[PDB]
Amino acid sequence: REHWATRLGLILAMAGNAVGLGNFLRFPVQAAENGGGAFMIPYIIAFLLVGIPLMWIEWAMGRYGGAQGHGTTPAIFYLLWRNRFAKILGVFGLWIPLVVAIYYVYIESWTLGFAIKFLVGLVPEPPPTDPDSILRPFKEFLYSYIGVPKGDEPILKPSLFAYIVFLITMFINVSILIRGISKGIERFAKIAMPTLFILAVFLVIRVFLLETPNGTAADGLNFLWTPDFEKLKDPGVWIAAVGQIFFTLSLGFGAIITYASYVRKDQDIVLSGLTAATLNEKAEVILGGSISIPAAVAFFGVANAVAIAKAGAFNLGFITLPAIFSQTAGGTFLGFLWFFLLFFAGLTSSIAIMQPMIAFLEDELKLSRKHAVLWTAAIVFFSAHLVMFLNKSLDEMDFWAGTIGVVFFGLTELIIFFWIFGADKAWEEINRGGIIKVPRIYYYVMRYITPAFLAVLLVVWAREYIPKIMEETHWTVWITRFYIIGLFLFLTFLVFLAERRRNHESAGT
């Protein structure tokens, strides 16, 4: 089985798995919509009671499965719980990352497309003070790129450039993945992460120099880091914070588990896991939190900045920030650096979310790495046409897989590993070979607190937030639901084939 070559490589690859679009695009919007400072308390708590513990648990499950030649959940869940239902629940560990990849790689391709256009200077020209006269050109720019509906039909018409850039993006993902864990992903991470860090720091510095009649970047930081305890009673803020924690750390995606399946049996995961997690949090709150929000607040003030964040999920990063940059000397190039940053952040994450399917095809169906990578790319490429052309399909997939799915799967993996497999056996497995030991208190957090925390969250979620959304949607949401349910059925069939191949092979030996 492949293995990470170096400790540093392992840490940077895991860091790249986590540090992505979630840090620079998702976090700012989530924090801004939920009162900035009021979002941070629940966020910090969620990191300590959910983020950290689940991270160790996934690293442990992955290393454990890898030692037996298995890197994905259908097999690993079965090793931890010899029950047919374990294999079925394990399918979510392939389904969630596949579905997220289907829309994540497309958004990633937009950042490459924008980077290219900003680099060559093929960008809108704002009319040298009206805020709408400056923002409109950038909104039209994004709308023409992805092809937002002008009529009443829920259809998108992406530009030819956008389509070709998606193809190029898939090619780049394949060019890294096809070389494997050590020579592909690990080698790339050592180049991408340092670049990402430098670009991010530079951008924060440039943003910190912004000052207008409406405010300064400093005002943005105070809005984000000023606590509002009167919001700690709001369930919505807790749901938002926990959701962000899962997404940003790649938890419940089956991705951390698959990467960890390449860690040697004796190798530490306690310190390595904690380091990867801490690196992501720094990139998120210090870098991601210091670019978009402060820039928006400085130019528009808090009230307007928050309104912009609520406007959409892409408004801030694809329309507002470049518009703001366009008002400064060298602003077009700064826009290029922003999109290039987003691209590398996205790329290091998309290779991580597609590796689970690759690992399954290699480990369970015995496909060569080449064939496994190519078929995975084909399924993602084909499936992405739904997100490219059907308005709101992206939103639907992000909801079921990227929001509900990850939380549900996180609770599922915890219950299989810490309750069914055995709390003490699990604790023993996590600490084995550790450079440091997990604080004793976390044994009780993992066994009682984390699972109770998530169970409640999911309950309040399903009875006070979904009944409304799961009934007021346009009929076209069923097209996406139908298709992703089919993807689940397809993956279940592959797991069935994998078990039949195992039986036949065994009976032959």
Ligand X SMILES: CCCCCCCCO[C@@H]1O[C@H](CO)[C@@H](O)[C@H](O)[C@H]1O
Least distance to a copy of itself from the beta carbon of 480, Å?
10
Q: Which of 153, 424, 464, 505 binds ligand X (CB under 6 A)?
A: 153
Q: Which does 248 bind (CB under 5 to 8 A by kind): ligand X, a copy of itself, Na ion, none?
A: Na ion
Site for ligand X contains 117 (CB under 6 A) = no
Site for ligand X contains 79 (CB under 6 A) = no
Least distance to ligand X from the beta carbon of 413, Å?
19
Closer of 419 and 478 to a copy of itself (Cβ): 478
Closer of 341 and 498 to Na ion (Cβ): 341
For residue 123, which phi and psi values (nearest 5 degrees)?
Answer: -130, 160
Sorted by sequence, the CB contacts under 8 Å of residue 105 that are 6+ apart come out as 166, 169, 170, 173, 346, 350, 354, 380, 384
Give the pair of three-digit tokens for residue 257.
Answer: 């588990």
Give the pair of three-digit tokens for residue 139.
Answer: 């909104």
**DSSP result, 412-472:** HHHIIIIIIS-HHHHHHHHHTT-SSPPPTHHHHIIIIIHHHHHHHHHHHHHHHTHHHHTTS
Site for ligand X contains 163 (CB under 6 A) = yes
Q: Which does 158 bind (CB under 5 to 8 A by kind): ligand X, Na ion, a copy of itself, none?
A: ligand X
Least distance to a copy of itself from the beta carbon of 381, Å?
10
Q: Which does 18 bind (CB under 5 to 8 A by kind): a copy of itself, Na ion, ligand X, none?
A: Na ion
Q: Which does 367 bind (CB under 5 to 8 A by kind): Na ion, a copy of itself, ligand X, none?
A: a copy of itself
Known binding residue 84? Answer is: yes
CB-based contact 30:276 (threshold 8 Å): no
Give the pair of three-digit tokens for residue 8.
Answer: 């540093």
Q: Contact positions toward a copy of itself, by CB under 8 A?
A: 153, 155, 365-367, 371, 375, 378-379, 382-383, 385-386, 389, 475, 478-479, 482-483, 485-486, 489-490, 493, 496-497, 500-501, 504, 508
Least distance to ligand X from the beta carbon of 163, Å?
4
Q: How far apart are CA 236 and CA 50, in angstroms?
A: 17
Give the number of other Cβ atoms within 10 Å of residue 153's Cβ: 10
- The CB-based long-range contact list for 175-182 (8 Å cut-off, 24+ gap) reads 176/347, 176/351, 177/351, 177/354, 177/355, 177/358, 177/373, 177/376, 177/377, 178/369, 178/370, 178/373, 178/374, 180/2, 180/369, 181/2, 181/3, 181/4, 181/262, 182/2, 182/3, 182/4, 182/5, 182/9
Q: Which does 126 bind (CB under 5 to 8 A by kind): a copy of itself, Na ion, ligand X, none?
A: none
In this structure, what DSSP letter does residue 330 have?
A: T
Site string for ligand X, 436-475 (x = CB under 6 A): ---xxx---x-------------------------x-x-x
Q: How far apart are CA 360 and CA 309, in angstroms?
A: 38
Closer of 25 and 38 to ligand X (Cβ): 25
Provide the pairing of β-strand 215-216 with 211-212.
antiparallel
Least distance to ligand X from the beta carbon of 315, Å?
7
Q: Which does 16 bind (CB under 5 to 8 A by kind): a copy of itself, ligand X, Na ion, none?
A: Na ion
Per 3-state DSSP, what percentage of the chain is helix, strand, and coil (rounded to 5)? 80, 0, 20
What does each C-alpha distance from 393 to 3, 26, 382, 397, 406 come to in angstroms? 37, 18, 14, 6, 18
Q: Which does 163 bind (CB under 5 to 8 A by kind): Na ion, ligand X, a copy of itself, none?
A: ligand X
Q: Which does 348 bind (CB under 5 to 8 A by kind): ligand X, a copy of itself, Na ion, none?
A: Na ion
Site for ligand X contains 155 (CB under 6 A) = yes
Strands (E), 351-416: none
Site for ligand X contains 281 (CB under 6 A) = no
Q: Which does 107 bind (CB under 5 to 8 A by kind): ligand X, Na ion, a copy of itself, none?
A: ligand X
CA nearest 49: which of 441, 460, 429, 458?
A: 441
Least distance to ligand X from the beta carbon of 152, Å?
10
Site string for ligand X, 378-417 (x = CB under 6 A): ----x--xx--xx---xx--x-------------------
Site for ligand X contains 329 (CB under 6 A) = no
Point out which residues bind ligand X (CB under 6 A): 21-22, 25-26, 48-49, 107, 116, 153, 155, 157-161, 163-164, 312-314, 382, 385-386, 389-390, 394-395, 398, 439-441, 445, 471, 473, 475, 478-479, 482
